PDB file of C-alpha atoms in Angstrom:
ATOM      1  CA  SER G   6      66.570  64.525 114.053  1.00  0.00           C
ATOM      2  CA  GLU G   7      64.743  67.825 114.772  1.00  0.00           C
ATOM      3  CA  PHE G   8      61.528  67.964 112.717  1.00  0.00           C
ATOM      4  CA  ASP G   9      57.823  68.599 112.965  1.00  0.00           C
ATOM      5  CA  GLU G  10      56.566  65.848 115.266  1.00  0.00           C
ATOM      6  CA  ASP G  11      53.239  66.547 113.582  1.00  0.00           C
ATOM      7  CA  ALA G  12      54.677  65.420 110.224  1.00  0.00           C
ATOM      8  CA  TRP G  13      56.506  62.374 111.633  1.00  0.00           C
ATOM      9  CA  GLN G  14      53.361  61.327 113.528  1.00  0.00           C
ATOM     10  CA  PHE G  15      51.326  61.902 110.348  1.00  0.00           C
ATOM     11  CA  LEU G  16      53.531  59.508 108.338  1.00  0.00           C
ATOM     12  CA  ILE G  17      53.403  56.903 111.140  1.00  0.00           C
ATOM     13  CA  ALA G  18      49.599  57.222 111.440  1.00  0.00           C
ATOM     14  CA  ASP G  19      49.188  56.352 107.734  1.00  0.00           C
ATOM     15  CA  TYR G  20      51.758  53.535 107.928  1.00  0.00           C
ATOM     16  CA  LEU G  21      49.822  51.905 110.827  1.00  0.00           C
ATOM     17  CA  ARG G  22      46.550  51.943 108.811  1.00  0.00           C
ATOM     18  CA  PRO G  23      45.189  48.679 107.280  1.00  0.00           C
ATOM     19  CA  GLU G  24      45.285  50.546 103.933  1.00  0.00           C
ATOM     20  CA  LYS G  25      49.071  50.345 104.047  1.00  0.00           C
ATOM     21  CA  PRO G  26      49.807  52.438 100.909  1.00  0.00           C
ATOM     22  CA  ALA G  27      53.188  52.115  99.159  1.00  0.00           C
ATOM     23  CA  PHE G  28      55.915  53.776 101.252  1.00  0.00           C
ATOM     24  CA  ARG G  29      57.277  55.721  98.255  1.00  0.00           C
ATOM     25  CA  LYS G  30      53.764  56.971  97.385  1.00  0.00           C
ATOM     26  CA  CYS G  31      52.873  57.729 100.996  1.00  0.00           C
ATOM     27  CA  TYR G  32      56.046  59.811 101.330  1.00  0.00           C
ATOM     28  CA  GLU G  33      55.238  61.938  98.257  1.00  0.00           C
ATOM     29  CA  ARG G  34      51.845  62.653  99.797  1.00  0.00           C
ATOM     30  CA  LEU G  35      53.529  63.736 103.049  1.00  0.00           C
ATOM     31  CA  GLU G  36      55.524  66.286 101.026  1.00  0.00           C
ATOM     32  CA  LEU G  37      52.190  67.746  99.916  1.00  0.00           C
ATOM     33  CA  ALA G  38      51.101  67.931 103.586  1.00  0.00           C
ATOM     34  CA  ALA G  39      54.514  69.226 104.738  1.00  0.00           C
ATOM     35  CA  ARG G  40      54.031  72.047 102.240  1.00  0.00           C
ATOM     36  CA  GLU G  41      50.623  73.029 103.675  1.00  0.00           C
ATOM     37  CA  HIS G  42      51.954  72.949 107.277  1.00  0.00           C
ATOM     38  CA  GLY G  43      55.460  73.973 106.155  1.00  0.00           C
ATOM     39  CA  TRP G  44      56.932  70.949 107.982  1.00  0.00           C
ATOM     40  CA  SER G  45      60.622  70.172 107.407  1.00  0.00           C
ATOM     41  CA  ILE G  46      60.679  66.452 106.496  1.00  0.00           C
ATOM     42  CA  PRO G  47      63.892  64.345 106.844  1.00  0.00           C
ATOM     43  CA  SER G  48      65.518  62.516 103.915  1.00  0.00           C
ATOM     44  CA  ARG G  49      63.396  59.553 102.747  1.00  0.00           C
ATOM     45  CA  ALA G  50      66.283  57.181 103.536  1.00  0.00           C
ATOM     46  CA  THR G  51      66.208  58.453 107.150  1.00  0.00           C
ATOM     47  CA  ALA G  52      62.421  58.011 107.420  1.00  0.00           C
ATOM     48  CA  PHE G  53      62.293  54.315 106.378  1.00  0.00           C
ATOM     49  CA  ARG G  54      65.398  53.543 108.501  1.00  0.00           C
ATOM     50  CA  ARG G  55      63.527  54.557 111.668  1.00  0.00           C
ATOM     51  CA  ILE G  56      60.509  52.504 110.585  1.00  0.00           C
ATOM     52  CA  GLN G  57      62.916  49.510 110.847  1.00  0.00           C
ATOM     53  CA  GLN G  58      63.873  50.591 114.365  1.00  0.00           C
ATOM     54  CA  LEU G  59      60.256  50.361 115.474  1.00  0.00           C
ATOM     55  CA  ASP G  60      59.852  46.539 115.421  1.00  0.00           C
ATOM     56  CA  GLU G  61      58.925  43.543 113.236  1.00  0.00           C
ATOM     57  CA  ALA G  62      55.769  43.460 115.363  1.00  0.00           C
ATOM     58  CA  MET G  63      55.089  46.926 113.940  1.00  0.00           C
ATOM     59  CA  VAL G  64      54.570  45.349 110.498  1.00  0.00           C
ATOM     60  CA  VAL G  65      52.051  43.003 112.136  1.00  0.00           C
ATOM     61  CA  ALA G  66      50.491  46.009 113.924  1.00  0.00           C
ATOM     62  CA  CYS G  67      49.102  47.370 110.646  1.00  0.00           C
ATOM     63  CA  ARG G  68      47.874  44.205 108.922  1.00  0.00           C
ATOM     64  CA  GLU G  69      47.103  42.469 112.243  1.00  0.00           C
ATOM     65  CA  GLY G  70      44.319  40.359 110.645  1.00  0.00           C
TER      66      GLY G  70
END
């Protein structure tokens, strides 16, 4: 995995927000941003896979209500 940390961090920053938009929708938006910054984004299957590797607590991290 060799890609714009700025883009990966951007996706993670939105995922950790209480808004918690749909993953499929959030990814399409990242493509729009990747275009503006010219970031090379990884395959969507690869992106969600790593979100699993974070932790179940990560899911609680966003909606921690």
